[model samples]
Target: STSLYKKAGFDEYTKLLHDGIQPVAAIDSNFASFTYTPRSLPEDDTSMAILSMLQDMNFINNYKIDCPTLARFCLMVKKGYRDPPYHNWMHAFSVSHFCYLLYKNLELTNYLEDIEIFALFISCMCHDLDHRGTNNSFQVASKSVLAALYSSEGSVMERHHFAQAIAILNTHGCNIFDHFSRKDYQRMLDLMRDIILATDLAHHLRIFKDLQKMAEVGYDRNNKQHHRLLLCLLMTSCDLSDQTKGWKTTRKIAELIYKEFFSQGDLEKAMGNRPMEMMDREKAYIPELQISFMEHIAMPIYKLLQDLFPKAAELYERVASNREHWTKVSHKFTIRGLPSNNSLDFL
Candidate 1:
């Protein structure tokens, strides 16, 4: 799986391992829980935690993944993330952890193939790699190079994120799936592309109706469409996992997201373009925007997931609870005439 594109740091990770550096044992115990607080862990610890999670899932033993190479690859993936307010490495780690929570809680192996499980987790980890704190519309409107390359096909940033993931995999000694047969290797890459692309909100919106239809009719393991739709839904679930956490965490995450969005809007205004209300700090009402997102995008996915797998009922409930909190905050802010700081800190 080696290619001309080389990433620096494999030897560094190997050297650290040689010196007896490792993730804490406590990480392994809490890693599978839905309430795991990834944001609190140190960056180096997080990479090792990922390796531990994969090991716990038996990806190491089952797929014959070399432990040291896996460690190096995890570190490389962590390095691939750029420091954005919401789409950074911490967010990716949280998303992947949520995917693991679902897999463990829902016993997804009964529904998804082993390769699908592997791809879904990896896709979550790489979904927003190198995000520049801007949306697809911003990329296109700003005439960014990524837009020039993929705007016509749409999902510009997501496509770029997928490209970055492929680049890391192609890096020397970074291919975790290197042990796979030729056919399996090719198929794994394809699965990674489709799952990563599914992280695009526009793509999720386009498939929302199909997802609803599937929920109504129930999942059919024999149906290929059903499998694709399920994978997409699962990917979105992980992307929006922040909203399924405690209200405090959800609100904090919302603020970070708006931090990124408002910065993009600031750029747009300077570039002589009009930003959408939600992206405009001056125009956006945080409480209302949060409430709307939960109602339309966040809650519905969890609802549909629970509709398919009743075991996910708690996830839907957590989102509903967060919605109620947002609604209450909206009411409070409406009376106060909005926050002067243009944030959710008013609560």
Candidate 2:
């Protein structure tokens, strides 16, 4: 079993399993019985319910995702703090559900069903696992320990995620591919690594740019090139789907993101350093930022998705409408001074 474990790298996965499983065990002995369970947050009961529903829907009965490698990866993601506000286990679960939703709704290439979906699901879950709560720019700016370890490589976070995943695969009793031949496992490993690394935001602009170019030139569905492009789009959509959620959910996510930014900013300010852009949490003008986010990021990305997948157009419109509503409500309050007591009470 040890040799088999070493060959498959099961030890790393088991450690992660214990890390994630302990919380469930503590909450209730029966918690681990479900395919997915909540860690519980006070503010968002809807989110918790949605998560449970999605997990139940995606469950593969009798085949508990018992892959120690994935379990460890999940724990890493759940406990790993990549920045303060977001990039926790909840974010990982949300992104996984988003990917699942996209796959279910879209008529993607057939290959996605047998292989790509699993890889993407795993990749989504692990992409930000063990995040250090710092953005790539911050790492690069501070010449942080991770930046040094990665030799200033822009994909430091992505690389760490991939290595951690591989380590879990190597853990004993958790080697997820004990049944696979060496060659087959190696190929799968390569695919998993590549897809996981592809989530890097540094690559987003180029990927989206190329997608835009392809759309302008028109896609040729008969060719593999078109399929690969679509895959990239699908991955990007999964990453960005937070913006497309219901306004209440999206707003909560936005608050988490801002909280992380401001917390980091406070640290930087205390160190006699200027805060990062958009790090000022005290500003009353957050609604403008939300509008800008929609215009600059969400709208452009969803428009692209809609063009390629007409069925998603309604979703895109809903997101846009939500943004518009926010913009109007926000404009009613002036930024120069805090909103009056009445305005605050109205909200």
Candidate 3:
């Protein structure tokens, strides 16, 4: 019956059906919780959880997405992710889950259209597709294929990530957006493109002041510009949601991120190029860098979000607590420095 989609690459999707893995009841219970860990779920259950999420969001009923097609799309999205330490399938699932949390906790449907919410969730899942454990600068510095492909337009990695997502959708039987009218299909693609590109940290940095302005003025659902800004903010929030999780998860994830960064550093050094201090294993100070990141990047997003969605106040508190924990241990690690390979000894 699934013969039309029976390419060799579709084996995982087949295995999923053969194993009869189903979405468990626990996924819904964990959906709204800030501390839910996607790592706890096996690959089969992860796909099931995604399907469950769509059902809970009423996307299945509202959009008339074919059940089997949507299931294949979920599995394909999972397969689209490469096993990079930080930006892997687990990371995508976690980010998507956090976006779900926002929609559930804040009742974002009132502020944004259903299609917009749909785009945000899809964007979160596809934002870092096929990531090579390197940032944009590294891509250009190495003159890699992706850099040559997108460096001129900028956001080298993100551009490729979005493309990978489109490729998956174009695949036979995985086009979850296939049922849309032509106009709607075009609109959804555009929204997905913008939202996915927003995950690039530089994009957030560029728009941070504007987000602050919106927070100060208060969100107006009537304004088109406000809608775009708010969507981007939510995407950024979900992308960095790991910072708001339990200390153990946050700390462990930080190590994974640094592992990827330092490996890039190693590559850059081998290529006779200088890497940033944060990436350079020898010179980087984990605690100081983590502190600066939270203070400048993660904390500001949560603080501003709490202004717009008061329910997100707990996210701010969690990030603040993690920052304090990082500070508490900063003094000890500052003197000796951390090994690039592994930084979770104190944890």
lDDT of each: 0.82, 0.59, 0.83
Q: lDDT by residue for model 2 over 68-122, one digit each (tens)?
A: 4445334434444333457665676656666666655664444343355556766
Pairs that collide, model 1? none
Off by over 4 Å in 3: 1-24, 334-337, 340-343
N/CA/C clash count, model 3: 0
Each model's TM-score, in the order given? Answer: 0.91, 0.73, 0.92
Better candidate number, 1 or 3, judged by TM-score = 3
Which regions of candidate 1 deviate over 4 angstroms? 1-12, 15-25, 334-346
Tens digits of per-residue lDDT for model 3, 62-95: 9988877877888788877766667788899988
Worst 10-residue lDDT window, candidate 2 = 1-10
* Candidate No. with top TM-score: 3
lDDT tens per residue, model 1, 4-39: 122233325865456443443556567566666677
Specify the poorest-scoring 10-residue window by lDDT in model 1: 1-10
